[PDB]
Amino acid sequence: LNVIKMKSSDFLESAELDFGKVSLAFHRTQGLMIMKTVYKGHNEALLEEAKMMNRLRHSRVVKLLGVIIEEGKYSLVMEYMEKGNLMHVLKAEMSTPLSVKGRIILEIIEGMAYLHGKGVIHKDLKPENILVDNDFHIKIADLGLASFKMWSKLNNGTLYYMAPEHLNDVNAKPTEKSDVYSFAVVLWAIFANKEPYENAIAEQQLIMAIKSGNRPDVDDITEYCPREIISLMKLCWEANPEARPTFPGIEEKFRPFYLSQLE
Amino acid sequence: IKMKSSDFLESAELDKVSLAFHRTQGLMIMKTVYKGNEALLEEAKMMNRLRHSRVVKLLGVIIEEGKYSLVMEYMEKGNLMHVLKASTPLSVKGRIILEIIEGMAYLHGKGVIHKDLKPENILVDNDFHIKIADLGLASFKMWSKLNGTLYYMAPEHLNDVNAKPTEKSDVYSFAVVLWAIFANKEPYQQLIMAIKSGNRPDVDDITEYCPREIISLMKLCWEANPEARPTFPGIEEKFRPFYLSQLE
Ligand SMILES: CN1C(=O)[C@@H](NC(=O)c2nnc(Cc3ccccc3)[nH]2)COc2ccc(C#CC3CC3)cc21
Numbered sequence: 001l002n003v004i005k006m007k008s009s010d011f012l013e014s015a016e017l018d019f020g021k022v023s024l025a026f027h028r029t030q031g032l033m034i035m036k037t038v039y040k041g042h043n044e045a046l047l048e049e050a051k052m053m054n055r056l057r058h059s060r061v062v063k064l065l066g067v068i069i070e071e072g073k074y075s076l077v078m079e080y081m082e083k084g085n086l087m088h089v090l091k092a093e094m095s096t097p098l099s100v101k102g103r104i105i106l107e108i109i110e111g112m113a114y115l116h117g118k119g120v121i122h123k124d125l126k127p128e129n130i131l132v133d134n135d136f137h138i139k140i141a142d143l144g145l146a147s148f149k150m151w152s153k154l155n156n157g158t159l160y161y162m163a164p165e166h167l168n169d170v171n172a173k174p175t176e177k178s179d180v181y182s183f184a185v186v187l188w189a190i191f192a193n194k195e196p197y198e199n200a201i202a203e204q205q206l207i208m209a210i211k212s213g214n215r216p217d218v219d220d221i222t223e224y225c226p227r228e229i230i231s232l233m234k235l236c237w238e239a240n241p242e243a244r245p246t247f248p249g250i251e252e253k254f255r256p257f258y259l260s261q262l263e
Numbered sequence: 264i265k266m267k268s269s270d271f272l273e274s275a276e277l278d279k280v281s282l283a284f285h286r287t288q289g290l291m292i293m294k295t296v297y298k299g300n301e302a303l304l305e306e307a308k309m310m311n312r313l314r315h316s317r318v319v320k321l322l323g324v325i326i327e328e329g330k331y332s333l334v335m336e337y338m339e340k341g342n343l344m345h346v347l348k349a350s351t352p353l354s355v356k357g358r359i360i361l362e363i364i365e366g367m368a369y370l371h372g373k374g375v376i377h378k379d380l381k382p383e384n385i386l387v388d389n390d391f392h393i394k395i396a397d398l399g400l401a402s403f404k405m406w407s408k409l410n411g412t413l414y415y416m417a418p419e420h421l422n423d424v425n426a427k428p429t430e431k432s433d434v435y436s437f438a439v440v441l442w443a444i445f446a447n448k449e450p451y452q453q454l455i456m457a458i459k460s461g462n463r464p465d466v467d468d469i470t471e472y473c474p475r476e477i478i479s480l481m482k483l484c485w486e487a488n489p490e491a492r493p494t495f496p497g498i499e500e501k502f503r504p505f506y507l508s509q510l511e
Pocket residue numbers: 019022034035036053056061062063064065076077078115120121122140141142143144145147
């Protein structure tokens with residue numbers, strides 16, 4: 001457990017930011033980190049959960065660096081991703097070029113393939129959980145703590161990326177195909193530079209529409225997105241979960257396309 | 264367009280909104296949208312330019328210490344369905360329909376498609392005149408960004424959230440409002456597919472007297488094919504002489 005134990009004295013300084021009690025801190029040897037804190041006023045179960053998450057080690061997946069438990073105040077600690085999340089970057093003034101968007105897609109695929117390979121279902125894949133560093137590499141995060149059972153309980157949601165089978169039944173068993181659907185909508189957003197379903201009027205309209213087969217508007221991306229990716233996102237958002245490909249399957253389809261046409 | 268909290272003498276919370284008494288311009292409804300940019304002011308100014316007697320006027324905005332609020336006209340009797348369930352004379356129901364037509368024709372003339380026309384967005388003043396509102400911020404794009412009845416939604420939008428709304432989308436919603444005005448009640452997955460297949464509010468459940476012309480109008484305006492529906496100027500051309508000779 002010492003592998004994930006951090007102390008306030010390990011950091012030179014920290015300050016609260018304007019979710020929840022999030023702060024930016026400089027670690028004495030490991031650099032800038034983001035800290036999320038909850039006040040409670042049992043700890044060993046929290047530390048083991050942190051140790052488990054810390055074993056998810058892959059270049060495109062957020063590595064939990066450690067936790068701090070002091071004075072009834074409980075913190076998770078991770079590396080600071082300066083450019084924020086994927087949608088923040090997509091909407092930036094600088095228009096992200098095709099070669100970069102293609103690499104982002106491939107890195108998302110790599111990260112999700114690793115997670116599923118480790119038996120991890122994400123359950124809330126979405127642009128907000130795809131973080132971007134200063135060289136435009138990405139890492140997959142779980143900022144809503146959907147996979148942190150204990151740490152989520154201590155703290156006591158867009159539907160655009162949620163698979164239709166989970167619309168109105170969020171307690172159904174999570175599946176790998178649930179994540180593949182989310183990925184399909186992320187693909188669309190990467191080329192649209194925006195959230196889907198802008199012409200929806202009511203939440204009930206949208207939920208029923210998606211369950212009936214409605215999908216993001218492909219006509220918004222045809223002049224930017226290559227045909228191969230449009231075909232890919234259609235496979236990945238098929239209504240039948242078992243008709244959706246695996247992420248290793250997606251990777252074997254997408255990587256040679258990226259290499260010859262995009263890189 | 265820009266107001267300050269100091270511009271108001273008194274305020275009391277009203278069943279995230281409050282009724283406030285302005286120093287010079289009188290009673291207003293205030294809603295704090297966000298607690299915690301120039302595009303917001305520009306959008307507010309464009310809404311302020313939507314000046315018509317049957318359309319709610321955005322009176323101003325308050326931007327103070329990270330607190331963002333919209334300020335609009337005060338409509339004493341609440342929304343249309345509240346009034347319908349209160350009894351409204353036929354000549355007043357006819358005038359209300361005509362005032363909906365006027366306000367919607369104005370909005371369409373300005374290029375504004377409402378997209379969520381319904382009794383809750385039709386506000387009634389002390390003298391039973393109406394104004395059209397957008398309480399769900401369907402047209403307030405930038406202010407909505409600071410942060411669900413399907414009975415009135417046209418079938419071309421049911422199960423297709425990507426189709427662009429048009430003037431005829433609002434005409435369908437108007438037809439169902441007509442039914443509600445004389446039924447005095449709200450209408451009606453299984454329902455959605457039924458509506459998309461041609462099911463409509465049951466005219467036979469209107470129990471009070473309703474002119475044939477109004478029965479025919481609501482059937483015309485809720486045609487499944489949007490091109491079979493009239494425009495609001497087309498509706499006014501037919502309805503105003505009817506109101507003037509038979510109802511006023
Ligand atoms: C400090 N912090 C963390 O360490 C988070 N960790 C993770 O997201 C994560 N860890 N390991 C993984 C890898 C994985 C991915 C999917 C499923 C399973 C595993 N993610 C959890 O709590 C936080 C919440 C929000 C923020 C923020 C912020 C910005 C807005 C200001 C920061 C954290």
